[PDB]
């Protein structure tokens, strides 16, 4: 018996095909699930992952900061014109809002 | 009862603040209470509904996110 | 003694306000309120200790929302105080 | 019992992209609920698209599309270069 | 010479069309448009005879309920004439 | 290739839509801002109608991949089933 | 072989029970689905279909027509303070829209 | 090949309400959608109420919640009512 290896492991990836797969199969989507579909949707949320995780980084190192925290997702989210699309309709607890003031209201 | 009472107006000129208004007229108030009460009812309905359908009788934080999903709102950070 | 013109104040509120985060309504007048409208639909009803966070995030969250739809509307008929027609338009334009 | 969670894995990834930062328990919670969330929206285009062409199972070509479908442009044809590449090369291995 | 005073053929055009049912639109400028759009994303595209119609209810729906939307927040101005502030005013209060 | 065809929607077609609404009195202006909306809304629904279009392989754009596409945005249409 | 009745007959309903009891086990919305929902459903969906055609054939007459046309189903769900509020997204071509004109559009 | 329509049943029950009156093909089309689409409301929410207590079958229960989430409170009420009484019925056959 050859030495187990992990199905990661052969396509690169970080997240874990073996729960994606149960999850498809345990959600009743479908009857049949290919082989390549949890690949690609690892993947795809992979890469969605880090690129949120990015944006916050650089945000928690401006604040001069350590730790990421909710603040730093929201400021994050908020002032990406893509982001935002596709998270219009998230609310995140403690996020709090981005500083506006309309210029009607500002002394002459 | 006079619990809703309790929604002082300091609150809502906290909440209108943070809204970025600069001045408030006087009957803001009593309409801010009703369109929150409507809104809780609302969520409390459903909510009630699922911790029925669970025999429970400890409404839990699950139900209330069901219930905003429900309503079209997704809530990020107490669960699910 | 120094004093600050009309607005001055309230401009340095919306700047403290809006670069806070802390929660805003008082915890135990939510709770019993949260408390006396469950009781219509069903009596000795019990919510643990989350359930009333999530929904007091969930309220203050639309609230700060129509405030700022309502901002908006006001500006456009050219005034500068809010009133209760405003937001009767603005929930009839969204559709509520 | 014992609850399964992505806290490994986001932690993995941002040590990847920032070694010297951190994470705190909240963000690791908002990050978990998230992942599930646009899980199940991907699944569910799927299953609408898989039966209205009569067809039982569920393949890449069905995520792909559902990838289009569902994120702006840009994203996805980010995205989707990322997964073409993915399979790929498991598919060689 | 005969004359009607400003409105009332204004007036009597709006008892008209709500009461009647016609397409409004020309269909054969439309189907150009439509084959006009499509082209850039794929060649040699084919409609059937029904996508078009489809389409043309889709859009004049929409357009008849956007200047409905977009009379109210007129209104409140207290003007009569409609002006593109309030398409646009109402477009951002909708959300999109 | 049609260079413009744009220009055919009319504004006697646009006043008569402006008349069912309710709309007593109409600007000058409301004409281009009209069609510039009416662009950005098809854009969106053949963007989608074409994908759908695609992935089935298929050379003919059918009246059910409308009607998903509008599906989709929540604009569920009664009468071509 | 006892000579076989339909479930409807046995329910009292017009609508298909077998016909709605099989589209549920092909719509893998669960692996069992009981005996109560199939019967419970076309009660629902039975009532539903006999106060839209109420109200539309109510409609009808009001107009001397003898013939149910779209006209007609507009105005009985646009009428209806409950309907309107489960079909407030719907679109009918050829409905076109409820005659309302502003009180100050009116001449003085 | 055969198709499959409700156009039947829609039939009948338009010939109980008003014996007297007939049905255009253009509103026979809109009554045939309008089935589908709350059919397919009820069944969703159904499935995800029993996926969330762990449950492998669909009962009355699922659909009498379902019923009183989506029909407002007074169409409900009815409907549960008579929904209550046919089961009875055929439980009692």
């Given at each position: 018996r050859a030495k187990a290896k992990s199905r990661s492991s052969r396509a690169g990836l970080q997240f874990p095909v073996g729960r994606v797969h149960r999850l498809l199969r345990k959600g009743?989507?479908?009857?049949r699930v290919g082989a390549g579909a949890p690949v690609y949707l690892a993947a795809v949320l992979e890469y969605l992952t880090a690129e949120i995780l990015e944006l916050a980084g650089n945000a928690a190192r401006d604040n001069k900061k350590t730790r990421i925290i909710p603040r730093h997702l929201q400021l994050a989210i908020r002032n990406d014109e893509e982001l935002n699309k596709l998270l219009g309709g998230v609310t995140i607890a403690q996020g709090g809002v981005l500083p506006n003031i309309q210029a009607v209201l500002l002394p002459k | 009862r006079d619990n809703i009472q309790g929604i002082t107006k300091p609150a809502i000129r906290r909440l209108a603040r943070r809204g970025g208004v600069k001045r408030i007229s006087g009957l803001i108030y009593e309409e801010t209470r009703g369109v929150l009460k409507v809104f809780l009812e609302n969520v409390i309905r459903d909510a009630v509904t699922y911790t029925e359908h669970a025999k429970r009788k400890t409404v839990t934080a699950m139900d209330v996110v069901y219930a905003l999903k429900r309503q079209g709102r997704t809530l990020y950070g107490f669960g699910g | 003694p120094h004093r600050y013109r009309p607005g001055t104040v309230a401009l340095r509120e919306i700047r403290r306000y809006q670069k806070s985060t802390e929660l805003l309504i008082r915890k135990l007048p939510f709770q019993r309120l949260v408390r006396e409208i469950a009781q219509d639909f069903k009596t000795d009803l019990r919510f643990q200790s989350s359930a009333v966070m999530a929904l007091q995030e969930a309220c203050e969250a639309y609230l700060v929302g129509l405030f700022e739809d309502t901002n908006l509307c006001a500006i456009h008929a050219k005034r500068v105080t809010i009133m209760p027609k405003d937001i009767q338009l603005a929930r009839r334009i969204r559709g509520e | 019992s014992r609850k399964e969670s992505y806290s490994i894995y986001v932690y993995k990834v941002l040590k990847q992209v920032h070694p010297d930062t951190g994470i705190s328990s909240k963000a690791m919670g908002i990050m978990n609920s998230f992942v599930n969330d646009i899980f199940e929206r991907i699944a569910g285009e799927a299953s609408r698209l898989a039966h209205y062409n009569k067809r039982s199972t569920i393949t890449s070509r069905e995520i792909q599309t559902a990838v289009r479908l569902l994120l702006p442009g840009e994203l996805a044809k980010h995205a989707v270069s990322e997964g073409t590449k993915a399979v790929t090369k498991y598919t060689s291995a």
């Open positions: 009743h989507y479908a009857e | - | - | -």
